[PDB]
A paper describes a structure:
In the specific case of formycin, the enzyme ForT catalyses C-C bond formation between 4-amino-1H-pyrazole-3,5-dicarboxylate (APDA) and PRPP, in a reaction that is driven by the elimination of CO2 and inorganic pyrophosphate (PPi). ForT catalyses C-C bond formation in formycin A biosynthesis, and we have previously determined its structure complexed to PRPP. This structure establishes that ForT is a member of the GHMP kinase superfamily. ITC measurements show that APDA binds to ForT only in the presence of PRPP, suggesting that the reaction likely follows an ordered bi-bi kinetic mechanism in which PRPP binds first and creates the binding site for APDA. Glu211 is essential for catalysis, and we suggest it acts as a general base to make APDA sufficiently nucleophilic.
We were also able to observe structural changes that take place as a result of catalysis by solving the X-ray crystal structure of the L24A/CAPR/PPi product complex to 1.75 Å resolution in space group P41212. The protein structure in the product complex is almost identical to that seen in the binary complex (RMSD of 0.41 Å over 319 overlapping Cα atoms). The loop at Ser174 is disordered here similar to the binary complex and in contrast with the T138V/APDA/MgPRPP ternary complex. The location of free pyrophosphate (consequently its interaction with the protein) is identical to the pyrophosphate portion of PRPP in the ternary complex. The single carboxylate group of CAPR hydrogen bonds to the side chains of Ser21 and Gln266, in a similar manner to that seen for that cognate group in the T138V/APDA/MgPRPP ternary complex although the carboxylate atoms are shifted between 0.6 and 1.2 Å. The simplest explanation is this orientation is a feature of the L24A variant used to obtain the structure.
Numbering used by the authors:
A (entry chain AAA), B (entry chain AAA): 10 to 172, 180 to 341
């Protein structure tokens, strides 16, 4: 037998609370989509040897380590995982957390265990700052996690904390039946030390900017999703993309390759709103005229301003498993 | 037969978005408690004449009008409602909405109808600004509604809007198993035109203040509730009570009678946090030392600084109905 697992990608709108005086830090607004997706089959390894196929080396080593640990934890068989459809690594799709939880849950099912995904996340050391991928793995839809309570020492040295349980979702909603335009831009994958050094230049952000981001997320995005108000939703997405303090810093860190696409989407009458997922290269867009947006993205792809584009829709469930032979 | 309905009071922490440039207006953070409570019995009026007992005149006239309308709407019998336990009127307990929805739903049950409470609210003209009482009637617990999308004209004349469907809850959580100390202060019930004139002096509030209130609510109160973090919860409640721009204006409008109690609660080591519900007179407090807080409130009541006090707990369900004879 095999356990077949499917999971959605995570698209992130913004991180919220990154100032040096707030009661809490982090917080992520995010949604789940069908494409790109993860599709993987977990079965007993014939030779009793853990085996991983169909991912980049970093994720494959990490899946092997996860399977060797869960094998010891649940006293299960050595597993092979064949990843038939991989989430693109370090592209703004939340691939590591989404894949570790999907495969872990699947191996869990193979072991006759039904794991808590927040616990599995903890066990595999995921969602230290973000609860987005962890929550969407469980629920799908649109979600905002409440990040982490800040300690009394926080105001003194905000840089030590900002950088064991993943934040639970303070908002979880079904995403309306609106199509999502995914835009794969030209974008570098960021340099670990270049990134840490970049983050320590931008953060802590002004307190007022944390507050405005909470306001745009909780009193902009989230009610628009809940009330299925397309115009309200797009107004909030654009306010985040084009005015969000931390988002602006992410766009500038990625540079012209992403900025040119966001400005093109804003300019285009076929694109009602557009966003950068994390630091990309994945951007995502909303349109009440997808026929027009298709034609717009096809020309950007021809010109070589983007590498690729596709329409997808929200996943309002999270991961799914089937037994197959 | 009779339908016996019980419903919790609504305690309000703060209104959120009351500036002249925000994507949305209003928004309420609130919770449901057992005491004060509503307890009412709805039966067929023997003489075929609508009858209301056990409330103040304003609410009684309004319940009669509601029963005469729902009678016509659902083609039901003339009802009598005996309100055995009334929510105190205009005291910060959300009595009108809570009572209209409880009695309407009960009469509904008498008519063999199961009404949508948001629709019933609309029908009876409730939750024009607040969704707090409407949502807590349905769910109980702790909730934050997302208020109302602001029109394009809003930025021009914010005063026209600020002042048909009630806002749905963007956050709904179970309240943890913490006791709530209710403090009934000396407080005037506000003058309709004194209030409208007061509101037009304070609102619109600065944009930065709207943003900080969203931040304290969504990235303060709500995650603390979700994670059952008492110290985090109290830190957020106090930040709202003592620094909330709009809350400060409500305290100053009510004056010394409420301000003296809030300052006493803040000063008291037995009171970890305290809040004013709307403009009161009801305040409410949290304590990890309720034995000490009991002794503190007993002395304030003896001295005559408060009229009354009681402990209660959260109601995590909303209204409940039973059939009785
Ligand atoms: N910069 C991040 C992250 C980081 O990605 C990593 C994976 O996250 P998940 O896939 O577990 O959700 C985390 O380390 C988080 O810091 N998330 N959202 C953002 C954002 O800017 O919106
Ligand atoms: N100033 C209000 C109101 C008003 O009370 C009335 C009843 O509300 P519900 O009982 O339907 O929730 C509404 O008209 C609202 O404007 N609510 N919360 C507040 C607050 O300051 O927190
Ligand atoms: Na556009
Ligand atoms: Na105190």
């Amino acid at each position: 037998g095999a356990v077949r697992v499917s999971a959605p990608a995570r698209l992130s709108f913004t991180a919220i609370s990154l100032d040096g005086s707030s009661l809490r830090r982090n917080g992520i607004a995010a949604m789940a989509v069908d494409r790109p997706g993860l599709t993987a089959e977990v079965r007993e390894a014939a030779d009793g040897i853990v085996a991983v196929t169909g991912t980049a080396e970093e994720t494959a080593r990490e899946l092997a380590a996860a399977l060797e640990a869960l094998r010891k934890l649940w006293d299960g068989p050595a597993a092979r995982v064949d990843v038939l459809e991989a989430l693109p690594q370090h592209s703004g799709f939340g691939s590591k957390t989404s894949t570790l939880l999907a495969v872990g849950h699947a191996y869990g099912r193979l072991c006759g265990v039904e794991p808590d995904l927040r616990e599995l996340a903890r066990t595999l050391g995921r969602g230290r700052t973000s609860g987005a991928s962890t929550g969407l793995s469980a629920y799908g839809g649109f979600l905002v996690d409440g990040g982490h309570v800040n300690p009394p020492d926080f105001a003194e040295a905000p840089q030590k904390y900002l950088r064991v349980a993943p934040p639970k979702p303070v908002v979880r909603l079904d995403f309306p039946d609106w199509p999502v335009l995914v835009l794969l831009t030209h974008g570098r994958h960021l340099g670990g030390q270049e990134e840490l050094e970049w983050f320590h230049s931008v953060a802590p952000i002004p307190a007022e900017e944390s507050w405005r981001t909470s306001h745009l997320v909780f009193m902009g995005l989230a009610p628009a999703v809940l009330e299925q108000d397309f115009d309200a939703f797009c107004a909030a997405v654009n306010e985040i993309t084009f005015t969000g303090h931390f988002k602006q810093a992410q766009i500038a860190f990625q540079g012209d390759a992403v900025a040119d696409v966001l400005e093109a989407g804003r300019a285009a009458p076929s694109v009602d709103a557009i966003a950068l997922s994390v630091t990309g290269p994945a951007c995502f867009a909303f349109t009440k005229r997808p026929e027009d947006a298709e034609r717009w993205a096809w020309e950007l792809k021809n010109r070589g301003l983007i590498r690729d584009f596709w329409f997808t829709r929200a996943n309002n469930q999270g991961l799914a498993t089937t037994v197959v032979s």
